[PDB]
Amino acid sequence: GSHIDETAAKFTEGVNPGGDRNCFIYCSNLPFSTARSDLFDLFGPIGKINNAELKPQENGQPTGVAVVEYENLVDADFCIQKLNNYNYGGCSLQISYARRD
């Protein structure tokens, strides 16, 4: 195949909360000043992130949502155990299994 940033759209487009022990993490209610580098700040000490991105929007405004993807299903689970009350920017983050991709 071929890639540079085409897959990073697919990594967040179509993705929703409320899966069940998939592999992807859905993260929501992030503050609107967040960027891709902030994911590895709070997720980096949990385990190995395979990939991670922020959800895009049709009008270009910030969504307040991230997706993350993890090496082992114990590490994906551990994010959803530990982060689902995490205070950041003045917001409390909501965390779930990313249901479709």
Swiss-Prot record:
One of its GO terms (cellular component) is chromosome, telomeric region. The keyword Phosphoprotein applies. Residues 23-100 form the RRM domain. Transmembrane segments: none annotated. It is found in: Cytoplasm; Nucleus; Chromosome, Telomere; Cytoplasm, P-body. Keywords: Chromosome, Cytoplasm, DNA-binding, Nucleus, Phosphoprotein, Repeat, RNA-binding, Telomere. GO terms for biological process: nuclear mRNA surveillance; poly(A)+ mRNA export from nucleus; telomere maintenance. One of its GO terms (molecular function) is single-stranded telomeric DNA binding. It comes from the Eukaryota. Methylated by HMT1. The keyword Nucleus applies. Present with 2540 molecules/cell in log phase SD medium. RRM 1 and RRM 2 recognize preferentially RNAs containing the core motif GGUG. The atypical C-terminal RRM domain (RRM 3) does not interact with RNA/DNA, but is crucial for interaction with the THO/TREX complex. Binds to intron-containing transcripts and is involved in quality control for the export of spliced mRNAs from the nucleus. Binds to pre-mRNAs until splicing is completed or until faulty mRNAs are degraded. On correctly spliced mRNAs, GBP2 and HRB1 recruit MEX67 to allow nuclear export. On faulty mRNAs, GBP2 and HRB1 associate with the TRAMP complex that guides those pre-mRNAs to the exosome for degradation. Binds single-stranded telomeric sequences of the type (TG[1-3])n in vitro. Influences the localization of RAP1 in the nuclei. Involved in modulating telomere length. This is Serine/arginine (SR)-type shuttling mRNA binding protein GBP2. The lineage of its organism: Eukaryota, Fungi, Dikarya, Ascomycota, Saccharomycotina. The gene is GBP2. The chain holds residues 329 to 427 of 427 of the full protein.
